[PDB]
Amino acid sequence: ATRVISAPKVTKKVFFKISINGEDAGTIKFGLFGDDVPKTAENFRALCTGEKGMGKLGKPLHYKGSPFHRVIPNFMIQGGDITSGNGYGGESIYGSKFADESFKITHDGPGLLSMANSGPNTNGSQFFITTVPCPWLNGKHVVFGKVIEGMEIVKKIESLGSQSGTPKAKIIIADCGEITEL
C-alpha cells in the first residue's frame, strides 16, 4: 500500500495526441477507473487502440480523427463522435449503445472523463472532460477516468470554445492509444 488515495484507482492508462487546425497541441493522458466501471473503461480503452476494427455503422471503432465538436468554456469539452463526426454520431464497442454502469463516481472537479448520452442507457463513444465541478450531472453521466497529464492542453482546447459550444478551431485527436510502457 503506497499512496492513500482519495479517489478511484487508475487501472488503465491511455492517451490522445491533439492537433488544432492541423498543428500539434500536445498529448493528454488519462487513467481509467477499471475497478469501478470496467465495462465503460474497456469501451474507452478499445476506442483508443482501435483494436475492434469496423463498427456496425461503417466507420472504425477508433477515436483517431474524431474532433471535439462542443467546447463550452468553464464547463467541459466534448468529443468522441467516431461515425459522422458532427456530434450526433458515435458507436460503442458492444454492437449497440450500452447501459449506465454506475453513478458512484461524481463530477466533483475539473479533469474527469465522463460519457455523453441522450438519455438513460445510451452510452456510445462520445465523452467529455470537465473543466469545472458539475454536480448537477451526477446520476446522469457515468464518470470513468481522469486526466493524469496534459490538463494544460484541455485548458487550451477550452479557451477555443463558445457559449454555444461551437469551437473556434478544428480540434482533432491526431493520434491515440493505450499507454503500455510502464
Residue numbers in the entry: 6 to 187
Paper quotes:
Previously, we reported that T. vaginalis cyclophilin 1 (TvCyp1), a cyclophilin type peptidyl-prolyl isomerase and homolog of hCyPA, plays important roles in regulating the nuclear translocation of Myb1 and Myb3 proteins and forms a homodimer in both crystal and solution states with the active site residues highly exposed. As compared with TvCyp1, TvCyP2, containing an extra segment at the N-terminus (N-terminal segment), as shown in Figure 1A,B, is found primarily in the endoplasmic reticulum (ER) and regulates protein trafficking of TvCyP1 and Myb3 toward hydrogenosomes and also TvCyP1 toward the plasma membrane. When adding TvCyP2, the cis/trans isomerization rate was enhanced so that new cross-peaks due to chemical exchange, such as cis-G54 CαH/trans-G54 CαH, were seen, which confirms that TvCyP2 is a catalytic enzyme and possesses PPIase activity. With the SEC-MALS experiment, the molecular weight of TvCyP2 was measured at ~20.01 kDa in a solution similar to theoretical molecular weight 20.947 kDa, TvCyP2 forms a monomer, which agrees well with most of the single-domain CyPs but not TvCyP1. The secondary structures of TvCyP2 contain 8 β-strands and 3 α-helices, β1: residues 16–24, β2: 29–36, β3: 74–77, β4: 81–83, β5: 116–120, β6: 131–135, β7: 148–154, β8: 175–184, α1: 43–53, α2: 140–142 and α3: 157–166 arranged in order of β1–β2–α1–β3–β4–β5–β6–β6–α2–β7–α3–β8.
Using the ARI crystallization robot, we performed crystal screenings of TvCyP2 under various conditions and found that four needle-shaped crystals gave good X-ray diffraction data, all belonging to the space group p2(1)2(1)2(1). In all four crystal structures, except for forming a typical canonical cyclophilin fold, the N-terminal segment contacted the active site of a neighboring molecule. A detailed analysis showed that these interactions include H-bonds formed by the N-terminal T7, R8, I10, and S11 with active site W141, R75, Q83, and N122 residues, respectively, and also by N-terminal S11 with Q131 of the S2 pocket. In addition, some hydrophobic contacts were observed: N-terminal A6 with active site F80, N-terminal V9 with active site M81, A121, F133, L142, and H146, and N-terminal P13 with S2 pocket Y93. In comparing the hCyPA–CsA complex structure, the corresponding active-site residues in hCyPA, R55, Q63, N102, and W121 form H-bonds with CsA, and F60, M61, A103, F113, L122, and H126 have hydrophobic contacts with CsA. Because both the N-terminal segment and CsA have similar interactions when binding to cyclophilin, this finding let us assume that the N-terminal segment behaves as a substrate like CsA in the hCyPA–CsA complex. Because the N-terminal segment of TvCyP2 exhibits such unusual interactions with the active-site residues, one may wonder whether this interaction is real or purely due to crystal packing.
